[PDB]
Amino acid sequence: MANLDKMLNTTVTEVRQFLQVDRVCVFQFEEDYSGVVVVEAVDDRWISILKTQVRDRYFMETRGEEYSHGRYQAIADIYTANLTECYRDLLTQFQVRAILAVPILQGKKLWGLLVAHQLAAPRQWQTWEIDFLKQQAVVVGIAIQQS
Ligand SMILES: *C(=C)[C@@H]1/C(=C/C2=NC(=C\c3[nH]c(/C=C4\NC(=O)C(C=C)=C4C)c(C)c3CCC(=O)O)/C(CCC(=O)O)=C2C)NC(=O)[C@@H]1C
């Protein structure tokens, strides 16, 4: 079968349950580095962002180049982090307190992001959790090719 959608759904569920976080989702980039939240596991208590189309200026202007070379975002508390206003308001609209966002690659090509959000309260991200989510993104990268 190699059903990609099923594997991705299982992945984000697996991650959300194991890290005990409020949302894990996959953001898939369009050809211009806009994109869509294509798969999501979220706690019922918060609003689902599934299939939201996002036109993020940082991604669209850089064309993901930094994320293609392994940059990631790990922020425990988005209100004390130094974020520009419009990006903080996107996160606020997604009800985010803390964010761990890692690149999903096809070779060196940035295909999307694998993102964990904490929505209840801030949350320190541990070293291993960053490695965990990155390694999950590796597994997704393999699956995408062969889907
Ligand atoms: C203003 C014009 C807005 C805008 C600008 C910026 N976005 C920025 C960085 C950025 N954007 C993302 C995107 C997501 N985070 C998610 O959780 C999801 C979906 C589930 C998406 C699509 C991330 C991860 C980052 C961090 C990049 C990084 O620095 O590692 C920035 C730069 C950050 C800053 O200076 O605060 C700007 C500016 N994005 C908007 O949507 C509107 C258009």
Author numbering: 1 to 147
What does the paper say about this structure?
By applying 17 rounds of molecular evolution to the GAF domain of PCB-binding NpR3784 CBCR, we have developed the first CBCR-based NIR FP, which efficiently binds endogenous BV and fluoresces in various mammalian cells. With molecular weight of only 17 kDa, miRFP670nano is the smallest monomeric NIR FP that fluoresces in mammalian cells as bright as twice bigger state-of-art two-domain NIR FPs. After each round, we tested the best clones in mammalian cells and selected for the next molecular evolution only those which exhibited the high fluorescence brightness in both bacteria and mammalian cells. Totally, 17 rounds of the directed molecular evolution resulted in an NIR FP variant, termed miRFP670nano, consisting of 147 amino acid residues (17 kDa) and bearing 18 substitutions (numbering follows that for miRFP670nano sequence) relative to wild-type GAF from NpR3784: V7M, F25C, M26V, Y27F, P31E, S41A, A48S, N51K, Q55R, T57R, I72Y, G82N, H87Y, N99I, N117H, C119L, L136Q, and Q139V. miRFP670nano efficiently binds endogenous BV in mammalian cells.
To reveal the structural basis of the protein stability, brightness, and specificity to BV chromophore, we determined the crystal structure of miRFP670nano at 1.95 Å resolution. miRFP670nano adopts a GAF-domain fold, but with the N and C termini located in the spatial proximity. BV is covalently attached by a thioether bond between the conserved for CBCRs Cys86 residue and the C31 atom of the ring A, similar to the native CBCR’s PCB chromophore, but having a double bond between C31 = C32. This mode of the BV binding is different than in natural BphPs and red-shifted BphP-derived NIR FPs in which BV is attached via the C32 atom of the ring A to a conserved Cys in the PAS domain. In the chromophore-binding pocket, BV is stabilized by eight hydrogen bonds with D56, Y67, T84, R71, and H117, π–π stacking with Y87, and T-stacking with F59. Of the 18 amino acid substitutions introduced into parental NpR3784g, F25C, Y27F, H87Y, N99I, and N117H are located within 3.6 Å of the chromophore and either directly stabilize it or provide for it favorable accommodation. One of the important substitutions, N117H makes a strong H-bond with the ring D, which is absent in NpR3784g, thus preventing rotation of this ring and non-radiative energy dissipation via photoswitching. Another critical mutation is H87Y, which introduced a perfect parallel π–π stacking with BV. F25C makes additional space in the chromophore-binding pocket, possibly enhancing BV accommodation. T57R substitution introduced a flexible positively charged residue near the chromophore binding site, enabling electrostatic attraction of BV and its additional shielding from solvent. Substitutions Y27F and N99I increased the hydrophobicity of the chromophore environment.
